[PDB]
Amino acid sequence: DRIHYTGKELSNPTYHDGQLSPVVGVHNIQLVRANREHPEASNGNGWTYNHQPMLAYWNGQFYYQYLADPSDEHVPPSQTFLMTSKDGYQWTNPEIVFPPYKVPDGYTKESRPGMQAKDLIAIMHQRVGFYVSKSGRLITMGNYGVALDKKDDPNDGNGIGRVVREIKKDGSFGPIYFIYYNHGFNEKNTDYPYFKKSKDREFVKACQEILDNPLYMMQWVEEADREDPIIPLKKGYKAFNCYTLPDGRIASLWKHALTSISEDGGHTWAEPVLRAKGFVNSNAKIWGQRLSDGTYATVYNPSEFRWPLAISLSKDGLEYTTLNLVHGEITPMRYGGNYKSYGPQYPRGIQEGNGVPADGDLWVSYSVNKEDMWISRIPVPVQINASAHADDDFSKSGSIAELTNWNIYSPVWAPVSLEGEWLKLQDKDPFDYAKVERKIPASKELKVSFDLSAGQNDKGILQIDFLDENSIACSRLELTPDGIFRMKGGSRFANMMNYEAGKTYHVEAVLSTADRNIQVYVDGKRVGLRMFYAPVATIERIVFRTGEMRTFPTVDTPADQTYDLPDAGGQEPLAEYRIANVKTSSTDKDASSAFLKYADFSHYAESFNGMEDENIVQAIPNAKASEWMEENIPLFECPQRNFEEMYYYRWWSLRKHIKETPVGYGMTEFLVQRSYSDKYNLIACAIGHHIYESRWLRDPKYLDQIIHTWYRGNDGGPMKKMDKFSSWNADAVLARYMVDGDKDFMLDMTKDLETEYQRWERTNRLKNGLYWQGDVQDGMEESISGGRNKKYARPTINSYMYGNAKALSIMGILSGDEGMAMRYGMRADTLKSLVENDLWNTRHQFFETMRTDSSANVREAIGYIPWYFNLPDTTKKYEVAWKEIMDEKGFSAPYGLTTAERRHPEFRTRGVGKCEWDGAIWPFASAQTLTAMANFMNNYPQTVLSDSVYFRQMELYVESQYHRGRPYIGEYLDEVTGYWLKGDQERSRYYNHSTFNDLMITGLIGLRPRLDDTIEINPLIPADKWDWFCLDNVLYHGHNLTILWDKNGDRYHCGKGLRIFVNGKEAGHADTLTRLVCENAL
């Protein structure tokens, strides 16, 4: 329908930057600095009215066109300049491309009776400057109008006409021709020939293409004859620009952000043409374009004043949702003049078809004060926030174009440059300064360090500011022209030290928003302490500026400037400053998170604390839970409320189970006191789940102690009641190691795990080698396959021992113990063979319990446990077991996965309310099944299960975890009705007998933990399920990981697709949700 802005960000005209934070890495580069007193080829020979830039990119070079008069708008003479650049930073001198033109003596207008042209030069005015033809030729164009006096309008449709000339590869120009005559002008009374007279056929064709292109005729309407047939839309909407939407329609913009749409390539336009809703814009043009990443951007003055120059982003070219700074400085206007107004203005970029700059970035031309010509480079994809702290070595960059993480403001007479290890700021400009800004992650506690050298100590100024997102500086450091390094404390200053020229000082600044103070160190010694002179919530920028900010102009400054500033073309004596080795860091609890912040998720803990009573308090009360979460949890978001809420709930729930004991932390299963528990209410049944879930907690002390408590907490030895439940704990301890990388913890636990393994091996094997367990001792009383006081070979304990054996073999190799590797690897091969040969039921095609004589002939959830440890072979015959996931007669039920196949005649025949494992949904089991299903989907060539199937079962697990309208994790539930089968009984509340977030992290998001330095992800989310999601703040192998997905690029503004970050630096990328492997990125 129409271009519009729905962002809530407004620009405040009382500040020159609008209080807008800039996008990352914007370089503002001055191209032309007007100087009447010292005219030179490089400044257009002293002309001080310079305005209306045009931009193209052709044959590896930028072409920058602008117009100029000696001092006053519409006061002749008037001409058009051209400049070129390979890189956008270093430009050739302005070259006159269309020169002053004689208005014929005797010219008149109806609006000026009695006047005639005599010895009068025309006024130039163009809204379009460039066309690249189909044959790859570059045409530049301009137009001549007539101003009979100061007040006359050259764009009245009574002008002379429009001219063109070819720009050639070699830098030369072809001859000037007229392409359009205003009424009354023709070949016989104009001073350049008509374009059709050229003997260059291909040039003539190139010009003819301009005339046949309605998008170009739309940009001739202001100067062309009124009502001229060749103009598609005849109303004088101003400074037309357009771009192509993703569906191929064309969206237009004009001054005041008037906007329309064309469905026929620009021949006709939708009425009524109205201002783009929500856009703040006035008279100084708005530029819109498609970017190289497929998204869209507008650049404009978001204001009734011509400042700042800002950028708004859109994923689709219609809805714009952001507002940030491009250019926020205002050079003072040095030379007065007719219609010159203050600030950066008249933005204009490259038309579609007129070239794509090789760096992929967004380049926009504009003037400042209609006096100085500028360009800005904006990196694409356009990033709002910094995802990592600074740690910058400038010697690694050959030129400023490589300072992707620095915002740079570089006037011709105050340029920014590199000099080996140094970022250098120079300043000889009495009216401007050099300025660099390092945007960093918004921080409450901040350290900033850098090396600093000044080329002098008796002149110049350097201000160093620490800024929030609204340009509030909380503190300022200054190198003064009387040789003092000082800090601003309020109205007064702290003089910290005298500084000398040519000396390198190591500066460290420590800022705390909560304590509201800054401490400054030089060469390791504290030299300054002060309160912030302005309070801020967080600090996001460090700014280095070779001057004081000017308050002029304000919203109260008069519009017109008739004076020149004193010494308008003079110089200041040169001041230089150099910085190197810029580092920032934060001790904020969530500083390790690159995109997500805990403050946006703390509402979950708060809601959970308020929604119901706290029945039982262990080591971490509800009152401490949010703080604990902020320290310990990876952060997650997605667009589906229930998944996100469950993520946070299950962490909040798990945390209740951390218990203080005289031997350190323990982890409970039931919060209520159980009569069969070991010391400190410990129950061994779900330890494997406890470790798999808890391995993601960032502070290792909890899980270190929980494990040591089980194995050493009973007079230095293992808890006695570990013998009451089957164990996959050696597998779980290796799984922990694969997340945290802590070799010494794992190596030190090896003997304890061997002792555990050997006990089970001694007590629980049949003569044939298979393990037996009573179903009660798997924690699964009243199963169909069964075994209260039976010695059946269940695929529970056999797979677990397979897993423990395999894990202990691997721990042997990591120990350097090759004997142990073989001893346990042999046990693993032995058990794998026994499970495959003896527990695979060939009638059912399913792993099942082996009773004394024959199979139990019941498909149970326990039959999927072999895949929890990747036990089975890749052969096709085992696949078919997984079909029962999608069969209502198998495991598929309305609330998720049953513990026994629904077709079985003994399904749920042993009563209710007393913990029965003959069919009801048990999260303990669902978690096993889902872990196994993920392994199967990741590690096996497999055609039975899609992502939709896995996602759907995770969704049902989510939906099942509610009770009385609130998140709830209990013991077990009805597969058809969803009823949690202990009802409102206290015992079930916050049950810790399963995983959830381990499944979210390793299956759904798909982080696959490994022993090596390679990162492997493979999300099992279908294509088009979620437009975005992110898992952040993950502590994996001593590094902080982020995994994110952003289909349209607008959730995180770091590009489209699937991305992995390591400590906030991108490590890999894919266009789709699919397997992504980053080799040796750790």
Ligand SMILES: [Ca+2]
């Ligand atoms: Ca152009």
Ligand SMILES: [Ca+2]
């Ligand atoms: Ca200066």
Ligand code: NA
């Ligand atoms: Na702001």
